[PDB]
């Protein structure tokens, strides 16, 4: 299994994989209980009021002022039972993802995607960037810095606004310069979204109630794909967008969708990113990887006692799949770069995960949400690692009956309708 231990929220802290921690938000915060579910990956069963000091208010703004697609509940994830369920739900989703070859590939890339040690000012020393770590309270009450790649945390005020958040650098664009940074995914396994089986209905803002429910494993995978891009520092600047011209409703409102989202969804959506721009990005990131190979060649000393310069240089040789010549000078090979870049951007896509999970899902990112549902995937009678909602040898096994909220109505509680609100 991907997660070797079946953590219970109430398990006593041990200062190793169950501990109270603090994140480098450059601000003050009370320690929160976190769980390390796998090498380099932690889960914090708390609403995210930490990554963004200006978003520490879970209370919903005035009713006369709410986003069409948004859902607020200041009480969600405030009790121990909820946190226990959140932990188990997230764990089950990691297992479901890991149970597929594609998921195993993605998770392996994520674990290997350690944020680059580019925090030194002297180009002859290799040093870690402190915001790619968390402070763990040890048994003796002291804090110890631990590097990590991924953190799954509860959503902020808007419960359905799942997203990858990471701490920036004063000068470096860590998610776009090949370096990478620790990713915090705001996510919840306790809610899901309804979509429509007919493409003409799903892509229309005035039709459909949300008959089918999105499998939360796909939703998490989507965020993990973004995380993969960001950990390898090849995320596409959100300023680069597609001026949607394939949907009259998006058009009549001048709605634009970032290339990063189209890339992440994959399938036909990825084709809206023309060849010219696609090559521009590839070249840009290729040069960034070159800079990394160069910085490593200059490094003649390592900072800290955690690991040896030899170890870290190898850690990044493997992450970026660099080449090494007679002298030991690293360089980026075009073939290996294209292969890794392609893996992270074309193999790991939402559309491909749908194929592996064999579930019904939105056919394009360019659609309109219909509703948000409350769910409980923890009980095996409701959802499993192997079949999601479509339980084998039951009436829910075929035709995605498990995702059909009308047939499998006991597993879904519609909290809000979005159709017509756009």
């Amino acid at each position: 299994p991907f997660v070797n231990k079946q953590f219970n929220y109430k398990d006593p802290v041990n200062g190793v994989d169950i501990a109270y921690i603090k994140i480098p938000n450059a601000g003050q915060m009370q320690p929160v209980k976190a769980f390390k579910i796998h090498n380099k990956i932690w889960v914090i069963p708390e609403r995210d009021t930490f990554t963004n000091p200006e978003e520490g208010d879970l209370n919903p703004p005035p009713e006369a002022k709410q986003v069409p697609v948004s859902y607020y509940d200041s009480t969600y994830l405030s009790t121990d039972n909820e946190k226990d369920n959140y932990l188990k739900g997230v764990t089950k989703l990691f297992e479901r993802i890991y149970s597929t070859d594609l998921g195993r590939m993605l998770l392996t890339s994520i674990v290997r995607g350690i944020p680059f040690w580019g925090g030194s000012t002297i180009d002859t020393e290799l040093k870690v960037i402190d915001t790619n770590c968390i402070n763990v309270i040890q048994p003796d009450g002291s804090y110890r810095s631990e590097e990590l790649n991924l953190v799954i945390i509860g959503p902020s005020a808007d419960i359905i606004q799942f997203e990858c958040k990471s701490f920036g650098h004063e000068v470096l664009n860590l998610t776009r310069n090949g370096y990478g940074s620790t990713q915090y995914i705001r996510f919840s396994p306790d809610f899901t979204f309804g979509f429509e089986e007919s493409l003409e209905v799903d892509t229309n803002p005035l039709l459909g109630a949300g008959k089918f429910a999105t499998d939360p494993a796909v939703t998490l995978a989507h965020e993990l794909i973004h995380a993969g891009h960001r950990l390898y520092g090849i995320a596409i600047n959100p300023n680069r967008v597609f001026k949607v011209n394939t949907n009259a409703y998006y058009e009549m409102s001048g709605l634009e969708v970032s290339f990063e989202e189209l890339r992440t969804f994959g399938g036909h959506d990825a084709k809206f990113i023309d060849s010219l721009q696609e090559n521009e990005f590839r070249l840009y990131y290729y040069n960034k990887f070159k800079d990394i190979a160069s910085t490593l060649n200059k490094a003649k000393s390592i900072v800290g006692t955690t690991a040896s310069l030899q170890y870290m240089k190898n850690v990044f040789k493997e992450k970026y799949l660099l080449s090494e010549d007679t002298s030991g000078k690293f360089s980026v090979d075009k073939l290996k770069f294209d292969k890794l870049y392609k893996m992270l951007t074309e193999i790991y896509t939402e559309d491909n995960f749908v194929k592996f999970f064999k579930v019904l899902n939105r056919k394009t990112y360019l659609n309109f949400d219909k509703a948000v549902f409350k769910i409980n995937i923890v009980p095996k009678v409701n959802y499993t690692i192997y079949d999601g909602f479509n339980l084998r040898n039951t009436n829910l096994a075929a035709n995605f009956n498990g995702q059909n909220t009308e047939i499998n109505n006991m597993n879904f509680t519609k909290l809000k309708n979005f159709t017509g609100l756009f």
Binding site: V69, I160, Q161, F162, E163, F193, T219, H222, H226, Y250, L255, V257, E261, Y365, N367, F368, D369, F422
Partner: peptide, 4 residues
Amino acid sequence: CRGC
């Protein structure tokens, strides 16, 4: 991000 989920999007619209």
